[PDB]
Scaffold this active site. Structure first.
Site, PDB file in Angstrom:
ATOM      1  N   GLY A  59       0.639  -1.176  -0.331  1.00 38.16           N
ATOM      2  CA  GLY A  59       0.281  -0.460  -0.118  1.00 38.16           C
ATOM      3  C   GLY A  59       0.680   1.340   0.026  1.00 38.16           C
ATOM      4  O   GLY A  59       1.845   1.314  -1.023  1.00 38.16           O
ATOM      5  N   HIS A 102       7.751  -4.745  -6.830  1.00 37.31           N
ATOM      6  CA  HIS A 102       7.700  -4.179  -8.299  1.00 37.31           C
ATOM      7  C   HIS A 102       7.938  -2.701  -8.201  1.00 37.31           C
ATOM      8  O   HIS A 102       7.512  -2.590  -7.214  1.00 37.31           O
ATOM      9  CB  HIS A 102       6.253  -4.428  -9.141  1.00 37.31           C
ATOM     10  CG  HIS A 102       4.674  -4.635  -7.850  1.00 37.31           C
ATOM     11  ND1 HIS A 102       3.232  -4.657  -7.573  1.00 37.31           N
ATOM     12  CD2 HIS A 102       5.021  -3.806  -6.622  1.00 37.31           C
ATOM     13  CE1 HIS A 102       3.250  -3.761  -6.865  1.00 37.31           C
ATOM     14  NE2 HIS A 102       3.641  -3.385  -6.297  1.00 37.31           N
ATOM     15  N   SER A 128       5.074  -5.818  -3.206  1.00 34.57           N
ATOM     16  CA  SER A 128       4.594  -4.468  -2.639  1.00 34.57           C
ATOM     17  C   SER A 128       5.250  -3.878  -1.340  1.00 34.57           C
ATOM     18  O   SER A 128       6.031  -4.361  -0.973  1.00 34.57           O
ATOM     19  CB  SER A 128       3.134  -3.592  -3.068  1.00 34.57           C
ATOM     20  OG  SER A 128       3.281  -2.293  -2.471  1.00 34.57           O
ATOM     21  N   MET A 129       4.869  -3.065  -0.318  1.00 39.20           N
ATOM     22  CA  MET A 129       5.361  -2.748   0.372  1.00 39.20           C
ATOM     23  C   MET A 129       5.382  -4.127   1.714  1.00 39.20           C
ATOM     24  O   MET A 129       6.687  -4.062   2.245  1.00 39.20           O
ATOM     25  CB  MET A 129       4.880  -1.399   1.197  1.00 39.20           C
ATOM     26  CG  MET A 129       5.079  -0.238   0.170  1.00 39.20           C
ATOM     27  SD  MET A 129       7.039   0.589   0.580  1.00 39.20           S
ATOM     28  CE  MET A 129       7.295   0.170   2.192  1.00 39.20           C
ATOM     29  N   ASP A 165       5.011  -6.658 -12.295  1.00 38.43           N
ATOM     30  CA  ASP A 165       4.624  -7.895 -11.003  1.00 38.43           C
ATOM     31  C   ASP A 165       5.608  -9.295 -11.211  1.00 38.43           C
ATOM     32  O   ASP A 165       5.734  -9.414 -12.180  1.00 38.43           O
ATOM     33  CB  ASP A 165       3.474  -8.141 -10.938  1.00 38.43           C
ATOM     34  CG  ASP A 165       2.502  -7.182 -10.771  1.00 38.43           C
ATOM     35  OD1 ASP A 165       2.923  -5.666 -10.069  1.00 38.43           O
ATOM     36  OD2 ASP A 165       1.542  -7.121 -11.204  1.00 38.43           O
TER      37      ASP A 165
END
Ligand SMILES: [Mg+2]
Ligand SMILES: [Mg+2]
Ligand SMILES: [Mg+2]
Ligand SMILES: [Mg+2]
Ligand SMILES: [Mg+2]
Ligand SMILES: [Mg+2]
Ligand SMILES: [Mg+2]
Ligand SMILES: [Mg+2]
Ligand SMILES: [Mg+2]
Ligand SMILES: [Mg+2]
Ligand SMILES: [Mg+2]
Lengths: 184, 186, 184, 183, 186, 189, 189, 188, 183, 183, 182
Positions: free
Chosen positions: K56, K110, K85-86, K159
């Site tokens: 996020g 990514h 992600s994060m 991704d």
């Protein structure tokens, strides 16, 4: 949500020191809460000053006039402290604090203006509500004149449209007594 | 949806050749302006011949409606009014303002009069300006009705304070129309 | 959308034979269209019968009373023919056709009942609208009594709630004169 | 809607009428207007009524059905896709011996749908009416199919789908046609 | 949002120990029933001691409000009313129905009286039933105000035909309250 | 967030306090939730003391018939007399619950409105299904009427006629109809 | 679907018929669409006959200032005198267009309302951008006022003071203010 | 709705004015509106390659790709396209105005003309944000160069003056070089 | 839509000018196809002028237009008048050899197809596979009309790729950039 | 919100206050309540104000800023993620020499956003006010950063993002801290 | 959520912290608060940070990353579902040698997502800033994975989904862990 101390919520803990907050708009809920707190504090001690911090864009006139009358009514002096904004009913509450004990922090904004309202319906009913809103406007102006020491006409002229003042300008207008920058 | 007649016309265009004009549904800028255009046209075609203005309207916008009223009084031809269903608010004002002696209603029509509606939201100063204006207009409308019905102004004022519904025969006794007509034959 | 013949739309072509349709709800638009057609037909020939086909669940009383008065007003007899449903203002228009010339196809449904309405507002205004809706109710009942030959009281009793009749029952009630199954 | 006037008006000139899509007051009235008009042009020539419809409002449909019986011309019916609810009633009500279906069509019969919200007294009134309508609809089908009433009542309690040959066997249509060139 | 006091209470619960009750915002089933519960409680705690009922309300539902009015008159203790901001519709009715001599308002309050609102949609028969009922209630409410204010019924009827706004001192001259109080000290 | 609230010494509110005195409230519409709350309170009070009267204050426009009939049945079922008090409106199921209070212990304050009328419902679906629900809503209409006839002492036919449309009564007319026993104006009186 | 419509002998409607007599209508709000329609009609009439007067009937609450100023400019630009007639409301840009008619040829029917007032606008964004649009809406306010001052003959200062808030006038007060030249009640009179 | 003029050959008012080589851009620039203008231009050229065309503009601007096609078509066709602002010319609107035939760009006295930089923006991956950012920057530079060429102002001056919305009256527009003449009346 | 001595589009169709304007969808594609077929009926050997201002849109609809352009006898010349992105840029590049034009200020964009499927893994697999085939064929079509190597096209269409008109000519998507008609 | 009272109250007992998320009247008042309360408990001990905020309402924020200067305790500020708009004003207004940032934080400064719809007279009034506020905000930053007013005015015309070391170099914070164990 | 203390506060008594669901200001700030608290209780003892998150907000998430690097205690991380992600950047930023994943977890990496609407000037500013941010996260991944930057850049363009064993091989975690006893 609100922090706990020692077990009170933060606002309850400050209420113990006679500190009350009006924060955000004036409506029936927020007005009543303030009124209940003032009555409570007077009950606790009818002679000690109350400190009423204001940060409000204003809102409902009837709800606000209740808070204002409650301030004049209870025995304790109610000192007022602007901590951001006091516009509309906000500025009126601020200016209605105890004589000589009305304050603002240095960067606050204070705004005065006339009442807003409106009714849709029959001409007859529009007449009734237009007359009443005119009375209310005149009476708010008279409360401001009284607390500021300005002439009525001056108050009328200066509230015709949104009138914004910095803390130092409001003190010179008589809306408050002191600008305070440091506890010392 | 409007049927056609042949060199082709819609039904309304055809009835317009007989100097029949309708106001049907709400008075708004669109419907009022249409009537005005037809009345100007009819005057252009023949300055002397009666026009027959059929009304069935709950009323609507006062300014739009008053354009139609002024145009009726303005143009050379007499505009005869015929209520066919309902005339209320501005509707009954237009009915009542037809040519003297030429204001009709069919037997089952309902005719209603009352004071203006409106209202503004805003600063008290703005509300004052609009309040005063709605009062001038309320006054001017009552004076229009008084003039066309023959009633005293004070009577008009009393009778339009709240919605006031009349059958065709009551509207005639009141002065809003001249004749109740049930049969082309009669 | 509507078919073309020879260049008319289908309804225009039937209008040439003095056939008018009321189809779907009665409102200011649909009522006015019918009225304009009747006036047109009388203009074309004030003595020839008009044939007014009805398939309507009813709708707005003031719009509908205009159509009804226009029928009694114009010189031509207006024969009525129910082709599916005639309820509310539908049945009233059907029953208000020219004496002896009111028809239904065999499977139609005819329904009578009292007026529906309503106002929100002041007690005073509710009184005014309640009285008026009561007058209207009584007058619709009197139009039905006249056309059916039933007693007023009978009409009152039978319209208190939704009252549904087959074609043959409506003819016996006096709402129409003939049930027709075949052109021959 | 292609120009040739549109395609449907060109076909109307050959006594061809379409009911396509739901039955409502608008689509039903259009058809009735076309039937009265064809009768007026020529009262003796057959009419060709093509049906592709999921059905719809009973009252609007019964007006179409009645007009079909009322006019002088024979109204020959042809199913081209679907005839359900009022669709199968109109198809079945076609002129004796002249009810047709293309072979892949579906034909569905079933009971009326409706309902009212309100006081019990009003629900009772509307319940009784739809029950009458249910019955009359059944009797119309019993008549055009040659079936016993009891049979219709039972076969329409829930949705009943038939293929074209099944609808023929059932009496809803007279013929399944595949080719114009076939006798 | 309601601050707490300590053995813990919310601010309102604490003020209730001093026989202070609030009606704030709209009269509806929820808010009216809350007041009723408090009044029953306060009576249970002490039958003789005054109760102080602070009102700031635009009114609301008549039946809910009339439960509060009947409960005030019902229970042993005197209920003293104090308007703090607004009392309109049922609000001003509750204000006026406080114990004789114990009806107060702060100086800036607005007090408004007027006739009931409502209305139904439905069959004409149903509309008739509800029209008659709203008339009985309009009548009964005027008789309540007449009784508490000392005004003639006819005066009440004239004065509530349309919204009627009063300052605190006017409401006292009218009989809706007994005293205007600006200072606990006085 | 309940009100007003004395905590434990999740909170102890004005309703819990009053329940300590065998006082129960039906306030607002009758639905599964509000009906079940009343039932639970009634059962609990019966558990605390079977002998002692319960005071059931009603201010309700009515609502769901099934949910309401659970309350009515529970009141008749439990050992304690359940006294009913109308404090504003008792309409629809409201008026039924009021009338179903213990014999001679049904009260209203002077300005209450009591309203009786027939049930409302509705179903969309197949004719068959509409028939079934239509028959049922008529059995229920009959039962409701029998209940009022029993508690008021009117003849069933009287109840039927008087409930065909909304029928508003003032408190004194409700007493004369037999829906309550006493109109009470003052505690000390 | 235009009305009422005589077809070609896509249709010939009452407005097209009247346009044949150099009569043009602004009806309802002034926006890009309605303003451009008027302009097109004005240019077309100038093309048919440069000499002949045009009759511009106005019934409008006003609307967009830019769109309206195109109409005002076009009227002054074309060779023909454009006579203005108020037939209901001329408010905002409406009243400006009315007042901008040819000299001595600006009319109202007796019951019209004419209203003048300052422009309304608004912008959300960065202080800089608000500053820019604020300065601009003040230049436009000045220009509008200059236009009315020119056509009425009032001093600019008078216009400024009289338009600070909505200012309603009856037709006779509009004539005395200089917004129109004649109130006409009857064609034959 | 749009009025009709008969000759019987009925055309709408806009078609009638088109017979005099008058074209209107009115309201926002988008694919539909830009294309109609282009079609008209192509039509007028085919009818007569030599005669001037009159392009009246009242537009808040809009889609840059749509606008640049009108612009390219004006420059491309044989006939001179004269531009007349009647109300507002902002964004692509002012660009189209200023891009009219040399010496034949007009405004009426009360028009407002506004210039400023392009708006847009993509949402998504950093890579795509980047690609779209680079593109919109070329487009910004191109647009500036185009104004510079038609106004005769230098590039840096254009850049400075379009950083934020910049509103001009007609006379200020003539002085800036956005148009050549302010006209008040047809006779003069 | 102005009338000239039918509408202006119909008028320009009399001169064999056709517009694709706005997004490529079924409706907008079919209109073009219909007009191509018509212009062919009228004159098989006369050139057609196909004007393009399009953000692209539906691939299948677009390919129908592309195929029809290659199917009919007439050379279809393409002229970009503002934007040619996605399927738009494909139709521009698929015009007759040597007859592909852009005006000077046009933007031309190529990229890979976009798609979406939600559902079972099997169904996602099936659709994934097919969009990959379509990606491949589209790259092949561009390679053929540009003169570029397939691998260059693949590299260059991985993300949105914007080209000014002269870049597109140098790339091989059009043949000429034209500023004036006389020249 | 874990119990240990919640986690934030446990930290409040160690003179730790958080501003997390937007500045509005509610979130700003909460902070002010915590500052008055810490002052009340001990007027001489430092306070630790952790900021992660995109900013928000100017007036609500200026109340927090003023309270920070008003109370006796030093309000040490620490950026932990983002300090933008009013966020960077509160961070920068921390006690001299005690403004900190974790190393990956973003710090953004820029001018006020606002706007009014209405009559020109009212727009003029609100325009002038926001212009005053713009100026005062600039002067506050010039003061806490040591930067020239002119510099602030120029650097806040549009969004200006800085990494932690850049914010230090700029004067918005005093130190970038990586480890508690580092001196 | 159950009471034993709610369940999470109970696990906090053992220095267990969960990040579960989206990384935003609220969820991130909770985590930071728990970290600081645990450092306060004992500044020497390891902390266990379980991660099940689709990622996020970058600014919110980098706050947590920094707080992890900053407090005295080692922060061990354990992926128990998803770390994308994060999420995966927090997982990877755990204490060296103490980054775990359960066997079935998915880890994905990514480039950042964002993008503004407005003037070209403003778009260019936010574009330039997101490109810095991009490079910065790439360097963080390179640092904790031991991978070359060019490799991280290539591998995060789109991704990238890895299983637990693939992630350990790539350097995003040190150990796949299947049974507590082993
Ligand atoms: Mg005091
Ligand atoms: Mg006349
Ligand atoms: Mg007749
Ligand atoms: Mg037949
Ligand atoms: Mg008492
Ligand atoms: Mg019992
Ligand atoms: Mg002129
Ligand atoms: Mg050229
Ligand atoms: Mg080819
Ligand atoms: Mg300090
Ligand atoms: Mg560490």
């Amino acid at each position: 949500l609100v922090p706990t101390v020692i077990a009170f919520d933060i606002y309850s803990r400050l209420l113990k020191e006679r500190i009350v907050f009006l924060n955000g708009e004036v409506n029936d809920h927020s007005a009543n809460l303030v009124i209940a707190q003032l009555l409570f504090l007077e009950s606790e001690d009818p002679d000690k000053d109350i400190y009423f911090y204001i940060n409000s864009p204003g809102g409902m006139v009837t709800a606000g006039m209740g808070v204002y009358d409650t301030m004049q009514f209870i025995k304790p002096d109610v000192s007022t402290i602007c901590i951001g904004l006091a516009a509309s009913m906000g500025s009126l509450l601020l200016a209605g604090g105890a004589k000589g004990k009305r304050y603002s922090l240095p960067s606050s904004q204070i705004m005065i203006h006339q009442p807003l309202g409106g009714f849709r319906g029959q001409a007859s009913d529009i007449e009734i509500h237009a007359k009443n809103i005119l009375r209310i406007k005149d009476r708010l102006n008279k409360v401001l004149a009284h607390h500021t020491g300005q002439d009525l006409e001056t108050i009328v002229k200066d509230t015709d449209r949104d009138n914004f003042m910095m803390a130092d300008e409001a003190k010179a207008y008589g809306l408050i007594d002191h600008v305070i920058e440091s506890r010392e």
